[PDB]
Structures are given as structure tokens and as C-alpha cells.
Design a protein around this ligand. Structure first.
Ligand code: HEM
Length: 291
């Protein structure tokens, strides 16, 4: 399967910076969502789940085709709760009907991270919508109730290595688990709509307790009111993972730099970019624009 990036006709940096600003302006406006967390965390989760279907072996799945717009992927049990990120973006797609679905879902994730004061993420245009029959089947996204060997093995399919996996998981400092979506409940920290390295700090400094929640699932709970998933706590159980966790709890700039590279790579897996294709765009935030 080859998927070649095709820039939307005649579009350039300024067009996509207009779509960025539209998403970012609505993130500021619709602030009440999920008890004032706002839409940013569900939008970086949506960009991860449309990319996380990729399989390196046959180049199926991935962010290129925008296939989450089809019922099979929209109704995947693993995507429960992401309909709220879709409905947030649907106004903006009506306003810029020329951007492809893959591009709009991935730029929403980029915009949310930078607007929640994360690192800049280089983003590239050119994903092309593909037919309903290209939609990957349910079951390619990871279970939460498993251990470190499962996480390592699952992420080899998206060929991410240990460092990349640990840098990507730092995004679980954002938002929260919702019992009616996943059977898990609670936030992982106090700053859950500002991008920081707090996931790593909480993992190493809190007093975790294995408890059973109302959906009868086990999760790691702390006195402070935070929770960690079994696959999250996995990172301090494995010796290779645990020493990268310590590296990111001791250096927030290295965390930001490595997250930026692994999230771009995540979003680009499966796509062939021609050598005459434009460079990756670095978008300015509303704040850097005085907007
Ligand atoms: C083995 C890996 C992973 C598993 C099992 C997993 C699982 C989960 C689960 C069960 C939730 C709760 C969903 C809900 O109830 O609403 C969640 C939320 C979230 N995850 Fe993951 N995740 C994984 C990796 C990642 C990665 C790599 C990213 C992003 C780079 C990510 C970003 C998020 C975000 C931002 C949320 C919060 C959503 C919200 O607030 O609504 N996840 N994760």
C-alpha cells in the first residue's frame, strides 16, 4: 500500500494557519466542556486514535485516509467519547471545506498541544480522503488493563521504540478517564489542561494503591485524588521504561523535544511525501500572534 501526500489545490502556509487559528479560537470559546477542562485533551486523543490504527507491515490504517468519518471506525468501542472531538471540529470543516479529513483531525491534535502550552509540533499537509472500504477494522487500538511487555509489543506495530513510547505516554497528564467511555475513572494530576511533564513526576512521587472502580476494573489510585491505568503504572515496573521516566521527570525540555518528534512521527506514519512537497509548517500560537 503506497499513500502519497497531495497538497490541497493551491493551498499554502497561510491557509492552514487560518484553520489553526479557527480551532484555537474555538478552544478558547468552548471552555466549559468536561467540567472546564475544555476540548484540548479529547482533540489530542482523537489525533492519536486516527493514527494509532496504522500497521507497519502492510501500511494499512494510519492518519492518511481520514476513515474515522466512516461508521465502522466511528463506532469502534475503543473510540467511545471521541464523538465530542468530531462534533467540535465539524463547524471548522464547514468553514474550510477544502481541507481533507485526515489533515483536519491531525491538525486539531497539533493545535490543542501548542495552545495548552506544549512544544511546537512540525505538521505536514497532504492527507487525502479514501473510500469507506479502506476503513481499518476494530481492534487495532491498545487495551488499558495490561502490562509493560504488552505496551512494548503493541507499539512495535507502529514502530515506536521505548523512548518514543514513554515520551508519547506523557500526554496522559492531560484530561481524564471517564467511566462511561472506558470503565476507568479519574484524572492523573492537577494540571490536566496545561501540557507539562507531571505524568512522570506523579508516577514517581505519589503513593499508589491498586483499587477496583465502579465498572469493576482495577486501577492505581492515590491519596491526592489521581489515578493511573495498569498500562500507565507499567512504566515504573519495567527497568528500561523506568529509567526514561526518571529522565523526563528530571528534564522538562528533553520531554518536550522528544514528545514533539514522536507525535509528528505518529501523525505521519504511512505517508509518502514527494521531494517537491513543502517543508513542515510550524504554526504560531494565538498568543504569539497577539490574537
Ligand atoms: C497503551 C497506550 C494507551 C492506552 C491503553 C490508552 C488508554 C486510554 C484510556 C482508557 C483513556 C480514557 C478514555 C476515556 O474514558 O475518556 C485514555 C485517555 C487519553 N489518552 Fe490514552 N492511551 C494510550 C496511549 C495514549 C497516547 C500515546 C496518547 C497521546 C499521544 C494518549 C492520549 C490520551 C489523552 C489526551 C486522553 C484524555 C482524553 C480525555 O480527557 O477525554 N493516549 N487513554
Amino acid at each position: 500500500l503506497v499513500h502519497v501526500a497531495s497538497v490541497e489545490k493551491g493551498r499554502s502556509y497561510e491557509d492552514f494557519q487560518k484553520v489553526y487559528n479557527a480551532i484555537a479560537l474555538k478552544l478558547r470559546e468552548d471552555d466549559e466542556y468536561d467540567n472546564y477542562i475544555g476540548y484540548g485533551p479529547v482533540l489530542v486523543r482523537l489525533a492519536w486514535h486516527i493514527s494509532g490504527t496504522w500497521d507497519k507491515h502492510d501500511n494499512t490504517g494510519g492518519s492518511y485516509g481520514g476513515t474515522y468519518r466512516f461508521k465502522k471506525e466511528f463506532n469502534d468501542p475503543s473510540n467511545a467519547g471521541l464523538q465530542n472531538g468530531f462534533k467540535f471540529l465539524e463547524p471548522i470543516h464547514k468553514e474550510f471545506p477544502w481541507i481533507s479529513s485526515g489533515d483536519l483531525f491531525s491538525l486539531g491534535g497539533v493545535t490543542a498541544v501548542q495552545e495548552m502550552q506544549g512544544p511546537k509540533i512540525p505538521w505536514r499537509c497532504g492527507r487525502v480522503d479514501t473510500p469507506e472500504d479502506t476503513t481499518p477494522d476494530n481492534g487495532r487500538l491498545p487495551d488499558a488493563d495490561k502490562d509493560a511487555g504488552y505496551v512494548r509489543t503493541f507499539f512495535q506495530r507502529l514502530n515506536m521504540n521505548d523512548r518514543e513510547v514513554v515520551a508519547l505516554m506523557g500526554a496522559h497528564a492531560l484530561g481524564k478517564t471517564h467511566l462511561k467511555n472506558s470503565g476507568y475513572e479519574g484524572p492523573g494530576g492537577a494540571a490536566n489542561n496545561v501540557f507539562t511533564n507531571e505524568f512522570y513526576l506523579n508516577l514517581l512521587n505519589e503513593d499508589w494503591k491498586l483499587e477496583k472502580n465502579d465498572a469493576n476494573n482495577e486501577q492505581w489510585d492515590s491519596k491526592s485524588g489521581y489515578m493511573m491505568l495498569p498500562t500507565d503504572y507499567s512504566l515504573i515496573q519495567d527497568p528500561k521504561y523506568l529509567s526514561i521516566v526518571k529522565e523526563y521527570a528530571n528534564d522538562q525540555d528533553k520531554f518536550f523535544k522528544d514528545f514533539s518528534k514522536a507525535f509528528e512521527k505518529l501523525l505521519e506514519d504511512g505517508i509518502t511525501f514527494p521531494k517537491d512537497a513543502p517543508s513542515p509548517f510550524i504554526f504560531k500560537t494565538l498568543e504569539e500572534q497577539g490574537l
